[PDB]
Design a protein around this ligand. Structure first.
Ligand SMILES: NS(=O)(=O)/N=C1\NCc2ccccc2N1
Ligand SMILES: NS(=O)(=O)/N=C1\NCc2ccccc2N1
Ligand SMILES: [Zn+2]
Length: 257
């Protein structure tokens, strides 16, 4: 099945998922000089005060923190978006070393990790219908650089020992995703795709300009997770990122001057 290794990684995905070579694949390099300020854009509305986290799962690719998405509890609105997008899960991508790990790049710079908060457009009723639509998802992407600890990340770090291997999950209620956001909501946006198979071209990407800082010890703990299942040979969960893809006929817009 697909993964991040040399034999099943990003260079192989197109054989099972031919959209990997499509017209609106993600991630991309954000060339900051080429991105254009768009006064048509609004401020992003991130409304997470009623978020209800459920569980944290090691799915063999990353770990996902899942939310109750049966009601408008944690929603993204505004910015480039029409309508309301409900938070369903977040996850990260990270490297084996601090100089790599992000999916998006900024002027070719790679960050140590990237957070994806995944939301689906409520007009499509549920996530599985939303992924079939060109405006079905909005993913809020946040870069992580290594420096001071992020206090709002620590509860995630501290549960990772309980989900070390593929298929493990743990209760993860009462987690506040507001604690993962930087101060500024300035962003870049473009139309793209899921960055993992099935690579569906359903995403409005909103990538914040300001990274969050996390400590070397926090990201070290991400790198102790395993891709494998319990009882199988250990393969550390590192370098679970897709590299930048061709921009093709797209424009990246900036919310800021
Ligand atoms: N609304 S709910 O059932 O409590 N929460 C939901 N259901 C569907 C789903 C699937 C995967 C991840 C999160 C969620 N969230
Ligand atoms: N890294 S990403 O762009 O959020 N890709 C994702 N997110 C959501 C999701 C759920 C189910 C299957 C694949 C994917 N892929
Ligand atoms: Zn992702």
């Amino acid at each position: 099945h697909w993964g991040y290794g040399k034999h099943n990684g990003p260079e192989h995905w197109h054989k099972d998922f031919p959209i990997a070579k499509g017209e609106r694949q993600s991630p991309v390099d954000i060339d900051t000089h080429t991105a254009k300020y768009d006064p048509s854009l609004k401020p992003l509305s991130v409304s997470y005060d009623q978020a209800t986290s459920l569980r944290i799962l090691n799915n063999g690719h990353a770990f996902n923190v899942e939310f109750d998405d049966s009601q408008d509890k944690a929603v993204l609105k505004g910015g480039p978006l029409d309508g309301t997008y409900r938070l369903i899960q977040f996850h990260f991508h990270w490297g084996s070393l601090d100089g790599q790990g992000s999916e998006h790049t900024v002027d070719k710079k790679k960050y140590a990790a990237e957070l994806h908060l995944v939301h689906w457009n409520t007009k499509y009723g549920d996530f599985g219908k939303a992924v079939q639509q060109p405006d079905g998802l909005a993913v809020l992407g946040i870069f992580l650089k290594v420096g001071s600890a992020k206090p709002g990340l620590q509860k995630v770090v501290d549960v990772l020992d309980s989900i070390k291997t593929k298929g493990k999950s743990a209760d993860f209620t009462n987690f506040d995703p507001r604690g993962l956001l930087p101060e500024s909501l300035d962003y870049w946006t473009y139309p793209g795709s899921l960055t993992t198979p099935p690579l569906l071209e359903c995403v409005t990407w909103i990538v914040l300009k300001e990274p969050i800082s996390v400590s070397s010890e926090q990201v070290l703990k991400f790198r102790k997770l395993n891709f494998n299942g319990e009882g199988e040979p250990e393969e550390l969960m590192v370098d679970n990122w897709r590299p930048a893809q061709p921009l093709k006929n797209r424009q990246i817009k900036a919310s800021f001057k």
